[PDB]
Design a protein around this ligand. Structure first.
Ligand SMILES: Nc1ncnc2c1ncn2[C@@H]1O[C@H](COP(=O)(O)OP(=O)(O)OP(=O)(O)O)[C@@H](O)[C@H]1O
Ligand SMILES: NC(=O)[C@@H](N)Cc1c[nH]c2ccccc12
Ligand SMILES: NC(=O)[C@@H](N)Cc1c[nH]c2ccccc12
Ligand SMILES: [Mg+2]
Lengths: 390, 379
């Protein structure tokens, strides 16, 4: 009942998908209180709200990452973006917001893959468009605050032709994965182009440190941690499988839930449905309108009934959004209590969310405007990142 | 051996006739190479387009390749190179040579480093054929892919336009093959387009490409010719060579495996003599009496087939052919003739190969502008 994969995301329950059942089906492990406390201990920092609230709820070998970090051994962060267009919605920002926190708390180098080739193979795009979207989307990623001296954002199309180690790993991986394997993992068929069939190796490749010689200089032992939306897991479930078969360490994973579509947690927000998403370029006006008109309500139909019986936070999309963006834990709790008791009407809850998203988006736009051509260029230039590994 | 006429029809290519051969002579001002005169290079695709372009002073470039399965290369491997080298001198055009170390890594039980090392070693033998270093770029797929601003981009464009079903029916791929093999065809196809070599053709996208190769490589190019239009590029032209026969018969297939499959480039004078005498399948009669009355058969005699590939002098070749067929010449004498031709050939190659220094191999494999100028203007 919780179908999930690299592109599509379906579920049939207003409360969202059953992530506990998904963990089991994926074979990953749940992020428990014990692990959350160990992360706090290891770092000396209070865990990000995404972890406290179960937004990042699943993982693979995080224990290993914590071991390595506790023993002063290095590890690096790796995440990515499919640049399907210049238009990005708030849902896309979840993993990046978290990765930025990860990079600050652990203080480690970050690698961000821009799959312009992926999007070229799958969508009706020109190479220039695809590449252009990677560069434009990179500005939105840089707007999240990543340290220019600790992070390399790269275009597949560009980097493939300027790395003495990337393509090499891509081939090693290509040899250790069959068509049957990828047909079962991603659902490919005989009619798909050969580019799609072999693509997974591209996305698997950045999991190995020697893919970035200008960063790790031939070392093949640095632990890799991949924070991503749960639906990306099949790429790395595959990656973890081949790693050993080719003498490389398995990458660790940190999974996040889906950011809800405006009409209900049954679907994730997707540009493939603009009415379901809030875009990073939406005006203050459009944000208010989308929330007021499209945000599914867990409250009662009439205000009288709402006062009498109170609302249901478990299916209310507006409350769900506050869960992702309202940092103050007490403020959120009060709203939960007041909404549940009917003390707060959905219209007010709605107003509350709007007052949170508008500044968030307006601020992101302000930051994005600050990334100049020279800045994007540097971020996207293979180079050494203030960190010595040898 | 194999019926090539019925092969030309199955493949839908074109036969290289005398008209075409004369045309090449006029266009080059040279006597056409013996492979052409003797039907060794018997088939083509668009060779007339290439000649039309050359005669109108338009440019074109050569593209051929090597699958470095090991360090053991044999006389059969040199055929397309010997011919391509001739084409280069004769037309005076730039040449691109692909060393598919990735293909071998995918298909053979080798490590990336082995595959790569073979490519470098094989490059020496290839260079030993005398290619002009100012006119030819030899590259490793593993190396070039990681340093070319245009190679990967073309591979991706190609991948986007070829389906698994397509390669399934062309190369016989199955669901159990690794994904690397499924998409490899796009790699062998890519060098057919000039902008895979920005450094050499200055980003030009319309340079005519001529690919000399053994017909078994054709499937890759029927595919390349098929997708070219679909991605805005001209189709590559082709010149096909026949299969070089294995010592035990044109019936069987060679192999860099069994050293008795053919004459290897590292064989000694003594080894060549031994191989020919002991292993060269004979078209001679069962007995000397039968031979004197009914004569030998050159169409199945491997030693003679060898001579058609390496005996320069036409009259001398015809004399041996006439005498063996008439029975005047015994197969032992024929054998002796081939041995006298081969030993100096292998010796010469081994000597020139020794002349190939590490630096030389490196320069040949270093992407660079070649000694040809290409202009490309726009705004
Ligand atoms: N709201 C969301 N919550 C979680 N993951 C999301 C969300 N929206 C998109 N993603 C992720 O982005 C990746 C691609 O998704 P999808 O193809 O739907 O994006 P899209 O509709 O093409 O929009 P875009 O072109 O801006 O990327 C997948 O990992 C998908 O799960
Ligand atoms: N959205 C997409 O099409 C994904 N393929 C983008 C992506 C590539 N590599 C990654 C690593 C971690 C998370 C996401 C990614
Ligand atoms: N021998 C092999 O395995 C061939 N795949 C080598 C090869 C690569 N590209 C080519 C172009 C023309 C002729 C031959 C080739
Ligand atoms: Mg998409």
């Amino acid at each position: 009942e919780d179908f999930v994969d690299p592109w599509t995301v379906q579920t049939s329950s207003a409360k969202g998908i059953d992530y506990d059942k998904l963990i089991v089906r994926f074979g990953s492990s749940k992020i428990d209180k014990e692990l959350i406390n160990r992360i706090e201990r290891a770092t000396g920092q209070r865990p990000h709200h995404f972890l406290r609230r179960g937004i990042f709820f699943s993982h693979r070998d995080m224990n290993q990452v914590l071991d390595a970090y506790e023993n002063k051994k290095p590890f690096y962060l790796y995440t990515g973006r499919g640049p399907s267009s210049e238009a990005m919605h708030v849902g896309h920002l979840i993993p990046f917001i978290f990765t930025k926190w990860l990079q600050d708390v652990f203080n480690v180098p970050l690698v961000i893959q821009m799959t312009d080739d992926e999007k070229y193979l799958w969508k009706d795009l020109t190479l220039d468009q695809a590449y252009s979207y990677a560069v434009e989307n990179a500005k939105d990623i840089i707007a999240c605050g990543f340290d220019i001296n600790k992070t390399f954002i790269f275009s597949d199309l560009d980097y493939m032709g300027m790395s003495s180690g990337f393509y090499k790993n891509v081939v090693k991986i290509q040899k250790h994965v069959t068509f049957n394997q990828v047909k079962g993992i991603f659902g490919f068929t005989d009619s798909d182009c050969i580019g799609k069939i072999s693509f997974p190796a591209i996305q698997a490749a950045p999991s190995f440190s020697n893919s970035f010689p200008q960063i790790f200089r031939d070392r093949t032992d640095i632990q890799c941690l991949i924070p991503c939306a749960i639906d990306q897991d099949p790429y790395f479930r595959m990656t973890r499988d081949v790693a050993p078969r080719i003498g490389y360490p398995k990458p660790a994973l940190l999974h996040s839930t889906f950011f809800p579509a405006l009409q209900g947690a049954q679907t994730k927000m997707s540009a493939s449905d603009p009415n379901s998403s809030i875009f990073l370029t939406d005006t203050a006006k459009q944000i208010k309108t989308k929330v007021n008109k499209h945000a599914f309500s867990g409250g009662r139909d009439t205000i009288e009934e709402h006062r009498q019986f109170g609302g249901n936070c478990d299916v209310d999309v507006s409350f769900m959004y506050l869960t992702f963006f309202l940092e103050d834990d007490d403020k959120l709790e009060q709203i939960r209590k007041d909404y549940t008791s009917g003390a707060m009407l959905t219209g007010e809850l709605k107003k509350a969310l709007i007052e949170v998203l508008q500044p968030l988006i307006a601020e992101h736009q302000a930051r994005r405007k600050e990334v100049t051509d020279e800045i994007v260029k540097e971020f996207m230039t293979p180079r050494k990142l203030s960190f010595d590994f040898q």
